[PDB]
Amino acid sequence: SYTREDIIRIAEEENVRFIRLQFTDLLGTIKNVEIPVSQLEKALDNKMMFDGSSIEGYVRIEESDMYLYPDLDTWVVFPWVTSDRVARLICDIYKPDGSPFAGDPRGILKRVLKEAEELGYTSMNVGPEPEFFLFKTDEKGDPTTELNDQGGYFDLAPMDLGENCRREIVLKLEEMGFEIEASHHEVAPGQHEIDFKYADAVKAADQIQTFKLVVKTIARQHGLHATFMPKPLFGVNGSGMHCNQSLFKDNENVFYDETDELGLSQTARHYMAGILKHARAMAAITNPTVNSYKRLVPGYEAPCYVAWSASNRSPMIRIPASRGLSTRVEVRNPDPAANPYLALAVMLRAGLDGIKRQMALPAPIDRNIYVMSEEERIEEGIPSLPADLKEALSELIRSEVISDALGDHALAYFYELKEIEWDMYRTQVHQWERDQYLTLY
Amino acid sequence: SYTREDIIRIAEEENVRFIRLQFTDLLGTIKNVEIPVSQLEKALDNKMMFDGSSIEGYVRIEESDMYLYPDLDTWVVFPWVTSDRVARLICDIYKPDGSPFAGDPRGILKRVLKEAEELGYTSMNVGPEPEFFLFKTDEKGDPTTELNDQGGYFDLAPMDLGENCRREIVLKLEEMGFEIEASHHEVAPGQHEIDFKYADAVKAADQIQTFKLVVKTIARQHGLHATFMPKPLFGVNGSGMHCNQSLFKDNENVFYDETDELGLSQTARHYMAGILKHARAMAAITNPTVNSYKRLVPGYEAPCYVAWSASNRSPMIRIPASRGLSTRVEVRNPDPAANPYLALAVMLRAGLDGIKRQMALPAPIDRNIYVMSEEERIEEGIPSLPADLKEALSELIRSEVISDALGDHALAYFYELKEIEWDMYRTQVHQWERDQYLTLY
Amino acid sequence: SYTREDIIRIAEEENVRFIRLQFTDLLGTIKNVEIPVSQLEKALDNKMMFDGSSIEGYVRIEESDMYLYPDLDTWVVFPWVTSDRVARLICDIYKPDGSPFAGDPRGILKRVLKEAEELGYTSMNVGPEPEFFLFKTDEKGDPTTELNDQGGYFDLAPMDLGENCRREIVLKLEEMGFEIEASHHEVAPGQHEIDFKYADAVKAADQIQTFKLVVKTIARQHGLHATFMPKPLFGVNGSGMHCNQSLFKDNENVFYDETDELGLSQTARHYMAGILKHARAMAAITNPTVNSYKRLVPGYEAPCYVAWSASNRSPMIRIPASRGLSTRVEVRNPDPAANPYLALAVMLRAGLDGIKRQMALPAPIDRNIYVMSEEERIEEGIPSLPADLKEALSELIRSEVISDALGDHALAYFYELKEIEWDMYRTQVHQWERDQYLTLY
Ligand SMILES: [Mg+2]
Ligand SMILES: [Mg+2]
Ligand SMILES: [Mg+2]
Ligand SMILES: [Mg+2]
Ligand SMILES: [Mg+2]
Ligand SMILES: [Mg+2]
């Protein structure tokens, strides 16, 4: 941990001159304030103010004044090998009267963790597996369509030192103290997955966000463009954020049970059942982009269906073979464009709803695959994820659990943002139409 | 502070070789004289002479001789990391007979501060929030139309070190001793806002001017073009230069009053009424360019209407939630192209007129927004700012307070400059006309 | 004249295969319907229907159905030297219930002529002098900035046969049966003026419309672009439509009076006074474009002032030396972009208002020119035309005569149209601003 005097002493020690008071909006894109070192004490006083309405995004209509409250435990200094070092602080947003802002994703996640703690579970161990694409840039600095390499799954194509981005990312994140479990080449050319070691929910989300920032910074440094867009190119597999989760009460993994046939406790079964039931509802927040539902198509490992299995090509919930303290539930649908705070919050809230209601877990699927008909698919009771973003929004509104989890104020603004996005998308005239048509009719 | 011997000692020890006897004209552009170190003593003697008529601008008809009187308290040295260091002095302009020149903006501001002091208020705490644009340059060194980045409001788009101008400018300004409250990305792509900590009026204006010079210089160093043009591109938000002002009387903020419902003293309300009544008159100076009134259009946060509110999308005056010694008056219409000396002078003079006349403050506007009709708009008593520069000039001439504040000599020359500018602008034939017409007629 | 059987017989003789049922909207642009010859009889039955709301322009909100009633006396056939010859018919617009449409400019002019006849004056002899610009086209067919020739005022620069458009226009208008008084080269390079012989008001307006159509058609044929935009290029003189007008009562020119000192009867003086008083009001309709008020600037023969003179550089009304049946009033301000029906209607309505009210004609101006001051300008009682479109619109609304002449329905739609145009124009950011600014600020 850290304290105010510790921060001041470290700033004096490291010659920190530049401070990034960080936070995030509902849209997920990293937001901040840049501060000189001479204001650091005032920063530690919980007194810095800013617009505040930026949380509502580009649809902000009325201005506010909102204060930044840093979390000292998240202090870190970037290793950018230059004089005038830069420091990072991750902050929460507070109203002028002192109460928390309802619409802050970190506030949402912490509220859901509080309501989890009230249920007796101390923490939620979360480990993500984000993948990113690197594209060669042009002379003006924009990404082109050609990838950085042409290797296959789990390859060594980015070898040597020439534009070896992956090694640089691993080393810088390690020097930042983040626990990197693995790093490797993913299915499509130019796709790199970075595995995190498991950590607490809030700090795991902070790890994901700082991961995105650092990966992009390094990519710009090597003359490449780093993108998390869930399906950048047609015909190649997209980017997934399989998240491994497990509940903890007093450093005890509640999911483990040697008496179970699969070694999964009843609490884990209720958790996964609750995740399954509200899956279509939570898709709108865990798959937030219009592009994301382009990735949920057959033939690219993408899980398009809601059923649980220990091992199958496309189930909603995968239960790994690791047991004991490492037994866990892997939810594979969410993608790197999704907000980690909101995604984890809705996952956990739906899971605790399932736990409280003691929902009956449906049977797992065998090696059986989903070439079956829709009549056969519904005969076995296997629903599917929403086809596109509009159905996801309608399901979100019709769902009374995750709407409560997001909160009344944030729900309206996120719904408005997604309505505007979808309205813009649906009225476009794409080139594919002019290819198919413009000659046939 | 500083003295003559201190200045000489600092120049000797710091190896200062180059001196900028610096001041401003009515047009606002930074003017100066370059001097070698060997004349520094003569510079400290208040004996340097120059044309003097440069204050009148490009319409000077008869030549004068006017002496530069430096203000030693504003001495500073530029840190450009090179041998043969350069030094800055901010000077006032004096007639050969010793009397002050009537047309100097700094002289105008100091005269208005003197007439404020005669009213019992010791000083005016002023903190600006200017914004500037970065445009990528071409091979020949001219600004192009494409911005440097594409981030949203309060973003972290300019990350890393590659052409990261925000960190470098903040650090250089801090090495000047500048009190930088914040620095962040603004609403449009490529728009950067720098927040200053509060300071005295004359020092605040000097801070704004040296701030502009510093930002433009650093942009040149990074191969970028820095502009304050109030509306550089159609369809994007322009530049705002909100000034937060508050009267100080012997380390006492006269505006604060715990007995008030909103925490504004009667003197504060008189200030509000005085600024509101003469708003249309002062717009001609605080919005000097023809382009500025292109920014005062609906839909881009631009306040187009004269009414006061604690929180609204577009009122004349915003009163922040901060209270106590930090209660303030944020006037939002003035833009960075406006001369800070003249803008602050006219604001304070109109406000002091309101204070003396004890003008009755009209009611604030609620969350009600301004889709309401013009007949209703005048029914509710909500006037609007002048549509363009010509009406602003006519209102300025018809106003008997602001014309007095600028002074008889300076008023004529400012009016002549703006008449020439508007006459040049109105007779042009722009490309938009040839787009709409040249085919329809 | 002509009749139904005459039209059918001529169509049989000339092998007319293509009919243009012509008309005009409030915008002035030529509109029509194309019909095959086999429907010609139905066309002569006044039974053809169309949208009708096209008269309101692009601001049409509710759809109608309106019938075309041709005027057989305006039948004419184009001499385009090709098989499958084409014929022209000029039509009025009628409601489905049989009543005239209020918003038709031809209907407006005919109503004003009817109210003139009710005053005892049989007709209005009108002869225009429109000028047009010819620009060289590029490869894709768009006009460039370079003119066709570089001759001076009244020149022979467009000589020979190579792209000698003026002769072609004169010859085709003569085969049209239109009476061409003269044709010559105008002040700026590339400007050709075509003088019409005098005709009745409605037929004169039809002559102007078909004149524009034929000139543009010929220019497209010669690989040139014909434009009537009043001030296409800065620094060159604009395009004017000096209109000569005189009232006729039973082939007797009421204006002539040998007893008058200058040979103008009291009726002519009242007419001129009525035109003078409502000049500012009628400018918005006789100078409709935003570009037109760019032409009303000093130094290019453009009349910018409301005063009458027999001979001066820039009076509102010019009285030529020709007398007897050739006495006339020449109104010089209206431009070729202005609707001829509307301009003639408002001119005549204001003139008859002056005649009825017996307005006292102010004194004429001598060779005195208008380098005199604004204080002098108002001292002599010489008003000026509105500076731009917005002032013209406000004056038009404040006027109770011209608004009545246009009619209640048409006034609202024209006002809305011009408000939209001016609103679009005022919020643009032109290149001239980025030239002056973007470096100075
Ligand atoms: Mg993977
Ligand atoms: Mg996995
Ligand atoms: Mg701002
Ligand atoms: Mg502000
Ligand atoms: Mg002419
Ligand atoms: Mg003439």
Numbering used by the authors:
A (entry chain B), B (entry chain F), C (entry chain X): 2 to 442
Which text from the study accompanies this structure?
In Gram-positive bacteria, nitrogen homeostasis is controlled by an operon encoding glutamine synthetase (GS), a dodecameric machine that assimilates ammonium into glutamine, and the GlnR repressor. GlnR detects nitrogen excess indirectly by binding glutamine-feedback-inhibited-GS (FBI-GS), which activates its transcription-repression function. GS generates glutamine from glutamate, ATP, and ammonium by a mechanism that involves the initial phosphorylation of the γ-carboxyl group of glutamate by ATP and the subsequent incorporation of ammonium. The structures show FBI-GS binds the GlnR C-terminal domain within its active-site cavity, juxtaposing two GlnR monomers to form a DNA-binding-competent GlnR dimer.
Thus, we next obtained cryo-EM structures of apo Pp, Lm, and Sa GS to resolutions of 3.16, 2.85, and 2.13 Å, respectively. These structures revealed that, like the Bs apo GS, the Lm, Sa, and most of the Pp apo GS states are dodecamers. However, a small percentage of tetradecamers were evident in the apo Pp GS sample. But, due to the small number and limited side views of tetradecamers in the data, we were unable to generate a 3D reconstruction of the apo Pp GS tetradecamer. Nonetheless, this finding, along with our FBI-GS-GlnR structures, clearly indicates that the current paradigm that all bacterial GS enzymes are dodecamers needs revision. Interestingly, overlays of the individual GS subunits show that the apo GS subunits are similar to those in the FBI-GS-GlnR complexes (rmsds of 0.5–0.8 Å for overlay of 400 corresponding Cα atoms between GS proteins). In particular, the Arg62 side chain is rotated into the active site preventing the proper positioning of the catalytic Asp50´ side chain and Arg316, which assists in catalysis, is moved out of the active site. In fact, the electron density for the active site regions of the apo GS structures are poorly defined indicating flexibility in these regions. B Cα superimpositions of the Pp apo GS dodecamer (blue) onto the Pp FBI-GS-GlnR dodecamer (magenta) and of the Pp apo GS dodecamer (blue) onto the Pp GS-Met-Sox-P-ADP structure (green) underscoring that the apo and GlnR bound structures are similar whereas the GS-Met-Sox-P-ADP shows large differences not only at the level of subunits but overall oligomer conformation.
